[PDB]
Design a protein around this ligand. Structure first.
Ligand SMILES: Nc1nc2c(ncn2[C@@H]2O[C@H](COP(=O)(O)OP(=O)(O)CP(=O)(O)O)[C@@H](O)[C@H]2O)c(=O)[nH]1
Lengths: 59, 122, 570, 99
RNA sequence: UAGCGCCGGCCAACUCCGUGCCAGCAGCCGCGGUAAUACGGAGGGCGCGAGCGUUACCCGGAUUCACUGGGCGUAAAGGG
RNA sequence: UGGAGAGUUUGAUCCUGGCUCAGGGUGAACGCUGGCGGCGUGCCUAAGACAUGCAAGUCGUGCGGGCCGCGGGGUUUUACUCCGUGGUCAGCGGCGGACGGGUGAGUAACGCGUGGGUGACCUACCCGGAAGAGGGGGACAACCCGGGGAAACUCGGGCUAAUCCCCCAUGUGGACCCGCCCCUUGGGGUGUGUCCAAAGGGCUUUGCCCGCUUCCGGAUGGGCCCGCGUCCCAUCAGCUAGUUGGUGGGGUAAUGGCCCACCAAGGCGACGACGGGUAGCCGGUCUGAGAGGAUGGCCGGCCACAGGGGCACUGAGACACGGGCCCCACUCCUACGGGAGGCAGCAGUUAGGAAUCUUCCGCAAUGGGCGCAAGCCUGACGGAGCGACGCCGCUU
């Protein structure tokens, strides 16, 4: 799980391309935030694109 | 015509042309499995992917290959023994059944819709 | 019908449960229609045929008359009147304060009831004309005068006309008709205005373009044009309204200024909770429409994952997440009730989650019944609540105030409306989930199913609840235990605990699975070789009796697992 | 639902009579000559050969049969005539053969 | 109607408070355990531009399939 | 005439090599936003389904009615048979129903490439050409009537037209067998005998106008048979009984075991079969100095199917995507007797799956089909509809 926003349980539909997280074997898939019932962290003002979040109105 | 368990032809929604029977459905003592009746039974033969798969089922008569009578004494024999299949209390799973016109079938008159669905040749 | 400005009206025949709300407008209206051996049979009005199971009509849409007046208004008035019984009213309320006035014949048998009072409470906020008409040909045994006059003492209405048109055939509104135009007000059909036109009942697109039949209360409209309502309304040209005919879509121009035309085209399956909230139609600068549209609350590996079969009518439960140790199964489905059975789970009745506030400051921490076992001294559960704000007839409080204490009820502030009659206004805070079990069914019985309820919840800080668990030889068992509040410990003990016996026994050990709720146990839920050396030796019997007796001590211990869960959950 | 060209079928149905039987006739007649070919009744076989010619061009009159194949029927049949005239035929008319 | 990503080094362009072996991003090395230029926050710069990252694939690059243009004793291997 | 690199190992260094990044790009894609205009372009995953409307005819200058009209009458009335027919529905008879619209599944093979072979052929309607163009008889639809039927339809009998068929003339000649000359594997010319021809209607009445016909000229189309080219696996190493040829025969626009019987015994195979996996394929496109590699959808070329499977029929030409026949699955309709159908055509719905499109508008030209012309159709095309989806320009 890429990100800073824990969510989702025994089941939660989302979707996934992956990307190397060259830290642990075989695992290969960083699901993007906010898609389907997965959420997205906020506050992380710039770099909202990855770890998707719409821009807040300076608030 | 009558049967506890036996080989009896299903010709219905099984993936192959057979069902093993279990027994008569109503009167405790009866032995005889009279036509115009629903029955408990099961397929023994195979299926192409399909749906109904292996398990258990309750369902109904077609034909006899053992002497009917009519009140009008119409008569009609047939060295073969297909019989109907049903889901729930009543409704017919497969929307397909090749078969002919025939007589005793509708006469229970609990399941009129079927009659249309098996009208034809052979 | 060429019927330009003027004329038209708004009348509806609403009544209690089982009253033939589909008798009057059945047929033989002289208008000529529905026949050819394929008559609309009993309980016409499209429907869905599926209701044939018990003619349980869901709603009443379309069905408009034309000619029938001895050379008068010809035909100018709606004819929609959804039936049922406090099962779709609130949700279908959208049609309540829609057409002024509402007809309905009182049942010669049961007679007036709750649905009568509550049904009227709406015929006011909107502004309609009362219509008292006792139907039913009096049947074999039944009074026509008493019954009629009856609904005149309580309802407060006097000989406001009616005529025992008689339910079965009989007169058949053979009077109301020529009287309708005389016993009804006008809805004003302005030739043009900035198109006031609130959204009516949703009707799928059938295969191209939804059916949002509107009603130009003050303005005109044509086909294939633009539209804009509050939410802008991203739409375009659309087919001309044909009107709620009896069969397939009809022809002719669109509706009029107040008529009952359906809005087709423009939309195609494009479903986005765009149920609407106003005339939706656009053309100029017309202020919004009377926000007289809204329902209320819920009252009570795939499979779907999106029961969007018709969110428009959906009670209120998008499945959500729900954290249930068991097989979760059905979720937030105990609200709709009475309604069910679709096509292709287990209704665990309630599933309240609540909000936990562990000490040391840990916020909600995602409250649940299996979210982090008990690690530190609980903070007394704590959660919200719901006050009591629902009218009532006669003195039914006696049963309410008694059962109301289902959860340390607190007389929020009893009240008694004046001018009314018996109708009171009690108030008492409580919980959420709790008000989901042994409440609904009681809410009616206690007061004979009279009046409803509506709150916003309330209550926090303290509130007992504990965490009643269970025992089963093994440990932790399936996944039960929640919060035994108010002796609720043993309350359900002899109930759920005594889960029959898991249906399956497995072995002849006879493990004693108690209820380690939090004690101090609470709940309290083999070969036959011995007799074979027959006729003697209360000795050797014992010899072979100990052999197996030793296995038990070596079985239950070594025989790990012995957990036959995933049975029925009951 | 009422596309109308069924025409061709049913119309052609009368045709499936026509030529077909006509074609069939050619066989019989041909083999009758062939039958005759066995027995020295060549005159007969060639009068029938004539008739065969007739059916050939009856087919020729319109959209029935010909190509080389008509002459296949011709040249074959008559060739048979010639090989059995070889069988001590002592041939009669040129009405069945070029002189 | 102006915005997205970007800044250890490659391969461009700086600090700052937060944080303090967590929470972390990460083409590649990985970079951080109480003063972090990679981690948050600003601010700046950079980049392109109404489109910017974005994986996936495609070959290239790459002589990492080699006819052009290779190597094969100890580095991978000469058949007993 | 076109070919940039860096980085990472170990205390350090240099090799062999591996990793991944700098290049561009493709039917795309979440992410943020999102002004317009222009252009391009959008099922490559179940070749599942698929509802309603719509995709191929118009011929009364072919033929005869039913059907409404126009008005006169043949006619006094009661009327209707009729003079033009104005039309019109159906039908008979004509030519198109194979070209267009689709998608590319299954097939690795002469199917396509690329080139030849066509001395074992065929062309509807094309112009050019020799022309040719009589008598005679006969059936069908509807019509009448009976017959079955909720309808649709289904059934007998009786009439009736003609470019329909037959009838024998009639031959500028054509077809074969046998015989010839001249090229010599079914080349081109002569040889007798058979065999063989086929409506008129339209118009302004003898001329026009469309047609009708054998034969010829080439045009054009298609066809087959081979040269060569045509994807990965040798843990698939031998397989083949119309399988290989011969006779003779058989049927076929045309050869060949395409088929049969019979005679023979094979016959292919490490140059790579018999298998297996995997795939319309070439135009091509993309990469890249080049060498080269990869891929092949929108645009062009055929095959291929065009519910699954198969077979034929008509016929100028097929194995017939809006035909027939039948099985196999499926559908909805029935009044319960029976039906009627096949959206991988259009447009468009669900299921699919991350992903993908207006139930446009139109006969205008461009295209075809008819027709002597008017005339008439066609979701061909046209432009527009909508997805920064790509692309060019465009202000902020
Ligand atoms: N004996 C009798 N039956 C009546 C009378 N009026 C109505 N009914 C019968 O009762 C049935 C139900 O009445 P009706 O109100 O029209 O239907 P409904 O109660 O609205 C059912 P739903 O609410 O779902 O529409 C009807 O099918 C009708 O046959 C009556 O006066 N006498």
């Amino acid at each position: 799980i890429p990100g800073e926003g824990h969510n989702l349980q025994e089941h939660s539909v989302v979707l996934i391309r992956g990307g190397r997280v060259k830290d642990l074997p075989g695992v290969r898939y960083h699901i993007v935030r906010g898609v389907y019932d997965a959420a997205g962290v906020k506050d992380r003002k710039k770099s909202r694109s990855k770890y998707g979040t719409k821009k807040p109105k300076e608030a | 015509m009558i049967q506890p368990q036996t080989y009896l032809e299903v010709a219905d929604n099984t993936g192959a042309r057979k069902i093993m029977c279990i027994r008569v459905l109503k009167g405790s003592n009866a032995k005889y499995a009279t036509v115009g009746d629903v029955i408990v039974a099961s397929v023994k033969e195979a299926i192409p992917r399909g749906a109904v798969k292996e398990g258990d089922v309750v369902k109904a008569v077609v034909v006899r290959t053992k002497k009917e009578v009519k009140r009008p004494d119409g008569s009609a024999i047939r060295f073969d023994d297909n019989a109907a299949v049903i889901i729930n209390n009543q409704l017919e799973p497969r929307g397909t059944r090749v078969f002919g016109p025939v007589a005793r079938e509708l006469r229970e008159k609990g399941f009129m819709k079927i009659v249309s669905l098996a009208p034809e040749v052979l | 019908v060429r019927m330009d400005l003027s004329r038209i009206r708004n009348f509806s025949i609403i009544a209690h449960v089982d009253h033939g709300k589909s008798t009057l407008a059945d047929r033989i209206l002289e208008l000529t229609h529905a026949v050819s051996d394929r008559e609309m049979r009993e309980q016409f009005l499209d429907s869905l045929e599926l209701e044939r199971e018990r003619g349980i009509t869901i709603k009443a849409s379309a069905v408009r008359v034309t000619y029938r007046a001895k050379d008068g208004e010809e035909y100018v008035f709606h004819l929609i009147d959804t039936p049922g019984h406090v099962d779709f009213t609130y949700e279908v309320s959208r049609a309540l304060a829609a057409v002024e006035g509402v007809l309905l014949v009182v049942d010669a048998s049961q007679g007036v009831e709750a649905e009568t009072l509550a049904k009227f409470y709406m015929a006011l906020e909107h502004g309609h004309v009362i219509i008292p008409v006792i139907n039913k040909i009096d049947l074999p045994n039944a009074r026509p005068l008493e019954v009629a006059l009856e609904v005149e003492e309580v309802l407060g209405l006097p000989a406001d006309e009616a005529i025992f048109a008689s339910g079965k055939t009989g007169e058949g509104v053979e009077e109301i008709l020529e009287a309708i135009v005389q016993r009804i007000p006008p809805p004003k059909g302005d030739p043009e205005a900035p198109l006031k036109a609130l959204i009516f009942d949703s009707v799928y697109d059938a295969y191209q373009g939804v059916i949002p039949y509107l009603r130009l209360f003050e303005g005109r409209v044509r086909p294939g044009d633009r539209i804009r309502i509050y939410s802008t309304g991203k739409e375009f040209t659309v087919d001309k309204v044909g009107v709620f005919t009896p069969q397939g879509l009809v022809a002719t121009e669109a509706l009029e200024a107040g008529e009952v035309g359906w809005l087709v085209a423009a939309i195609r399956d494009i479903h986005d909770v765009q149920v609407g909230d106003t005339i939706t139609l656009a053309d100029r600068p017309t202020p919004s429409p009377y926000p007289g549209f809204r329902p209320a609350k819920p009252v009570v590996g795939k499979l779907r994952d999106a029961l969007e079969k018709l969110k428009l009518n959906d009670a209120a439960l998008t499945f959500e997440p729900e954290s249930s140790t068991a097989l979760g199964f059905g979720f937030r489905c105990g609200f709709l009730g009475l309604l069910h059975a679709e096509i292709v789970l287990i209704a665990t009745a309630p599933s309240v989650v609540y909000k936990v506030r562990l000490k040391s400051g840990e916020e909600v921490e995602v409250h649940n019944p299996a979210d982090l076992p008990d690690p530190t001294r609980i903070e007394e559960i704590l959660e919200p609540y719901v006050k009591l704000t629902i009218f009532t007839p006669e003195e039914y409080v006696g049963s309410l105030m008694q059962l109301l204490q289902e959860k340390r009820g607190r007389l929020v502030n009893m009240n008694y409306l004046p001018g009314a009659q018996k109708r009171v206004e009690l108030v008492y805070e409580a919980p959420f989930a709790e008000i989901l079990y042994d409440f609904h069914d009681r809410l009616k019985s206690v007061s004979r199913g009279y009046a409803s309820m509506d709150y916003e919840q309330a209550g926090y800080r303290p509130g007992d609840l504990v965490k009643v668990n269970v025992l089963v030889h093994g440990e932790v068992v399936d996944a039960l235990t929640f919060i035994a509040h108010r002796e609720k410990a043993y309350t359900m003990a002899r109930a759920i605990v005594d889960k029959l016996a898991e249906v399956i026994p497995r072995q002849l050990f006879e493990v004693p699975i108690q209820a380690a709720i939090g004690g101090k146990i609470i709940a309290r839920a083999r070969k036959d070789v011995l007799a074979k050396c027959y006729g003697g030796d209360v000795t050797r019997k014992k010899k072979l009796l100990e052999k197996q007796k030793e296995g038990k001590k070596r079985l239950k211990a070594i025989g790990k697992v012995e957990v036959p869960q995933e049975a029925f959950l009951a | 639902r009422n596309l109308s060209a069924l025409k061709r079928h049913r119309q052609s149905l009368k045709r499936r009579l026509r030529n077909k039987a006509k074609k069939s006739a050619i066989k019989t007649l041909s083999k009758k000559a062939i039958q005759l070919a066995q027995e020295g009744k060549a005159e007969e076989a060639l009068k029938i050969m004539r008739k065969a010619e007739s059916l050939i061009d009856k087919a020729a009159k319109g959209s029935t049969l010909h190509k080389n194949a008509a002459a296949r029927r011709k040249s074959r049949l008559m060739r048979k005539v010639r090989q059995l005239l070889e069988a001590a035929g002592a041939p009669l008319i040129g009405g069945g053969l070029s002189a």
